[PDB]
Coordinates of C-alpha atoms in Angstrom, one line a residue:
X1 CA 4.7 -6.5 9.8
X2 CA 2.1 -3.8 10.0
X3 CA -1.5 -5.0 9.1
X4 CA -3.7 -2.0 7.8
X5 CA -6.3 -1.3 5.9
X6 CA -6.1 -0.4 1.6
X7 CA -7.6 3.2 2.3
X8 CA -7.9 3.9 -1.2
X9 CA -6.2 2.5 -4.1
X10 CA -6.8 4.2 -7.9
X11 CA -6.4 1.1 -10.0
X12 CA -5.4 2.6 -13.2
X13 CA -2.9 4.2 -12.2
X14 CA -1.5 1.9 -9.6
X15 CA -1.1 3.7 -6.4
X16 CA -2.7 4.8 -2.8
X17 CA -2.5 5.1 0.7
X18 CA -2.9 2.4 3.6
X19 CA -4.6 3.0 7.2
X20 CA -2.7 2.0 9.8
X21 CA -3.5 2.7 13.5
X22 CA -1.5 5.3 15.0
X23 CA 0.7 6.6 11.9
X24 CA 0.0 8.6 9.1
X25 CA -1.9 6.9 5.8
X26 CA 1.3 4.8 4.1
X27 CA 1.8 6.2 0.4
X28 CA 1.7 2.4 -1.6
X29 CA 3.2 1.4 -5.2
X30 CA 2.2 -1.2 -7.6
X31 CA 5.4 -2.7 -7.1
X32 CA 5.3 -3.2 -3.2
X33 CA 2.4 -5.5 -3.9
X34 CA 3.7 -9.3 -3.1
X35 CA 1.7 -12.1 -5.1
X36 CA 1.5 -13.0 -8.6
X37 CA -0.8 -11.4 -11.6
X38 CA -2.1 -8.2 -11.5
X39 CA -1.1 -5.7 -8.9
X40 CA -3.8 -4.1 -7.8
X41 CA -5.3 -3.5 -4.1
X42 CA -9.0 -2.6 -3.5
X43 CA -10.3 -0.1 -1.0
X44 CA -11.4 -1.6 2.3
X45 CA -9.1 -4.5 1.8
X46 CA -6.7 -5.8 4.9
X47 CA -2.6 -6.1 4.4
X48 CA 0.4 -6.5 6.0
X49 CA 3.3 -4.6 5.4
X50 CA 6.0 -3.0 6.2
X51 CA 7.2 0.7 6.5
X52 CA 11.0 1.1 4.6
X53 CA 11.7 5.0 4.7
X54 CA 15.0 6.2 2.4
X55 CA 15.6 9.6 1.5
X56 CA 12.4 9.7 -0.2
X57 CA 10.4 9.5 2.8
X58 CA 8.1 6.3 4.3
X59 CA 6.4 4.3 1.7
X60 CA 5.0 0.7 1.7
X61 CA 7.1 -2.1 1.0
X62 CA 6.1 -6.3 0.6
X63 CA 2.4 -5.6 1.2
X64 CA 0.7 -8.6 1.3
X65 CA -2.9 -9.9 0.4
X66 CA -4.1 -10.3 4.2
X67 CA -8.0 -10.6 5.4

């Protein structure tokens, strides 16, 4: 997996973009967020994830809570 960095996450309404070294900012979902409880992600935080690119273009997918 990827590990980058929650660049900015808007909380209410449950998306953002992750930093990754040498790629664009990933576009990130509620519902790529692994864990239970609330999905959320703050900015700053570490994760790891993965890349999964369909026809709608690269987005997150099982991001993961890293540190």
């Amino acid at each position: 997996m990827l590990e980058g960095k929650v660049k900015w996450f808007n909380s209410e309404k449950g998306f953002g973009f992750i930093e990754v070294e040498g790629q664009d900012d990933v576009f990130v979902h509620f519902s790529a967020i692994q864990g239970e409880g609330f999905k959320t992600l703050e900015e700053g935080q570490a994760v790891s994830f993965e890349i999964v690119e369909g026809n709608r273009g690269p987005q997150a997918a099982n991001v993961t809570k890293e540190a």
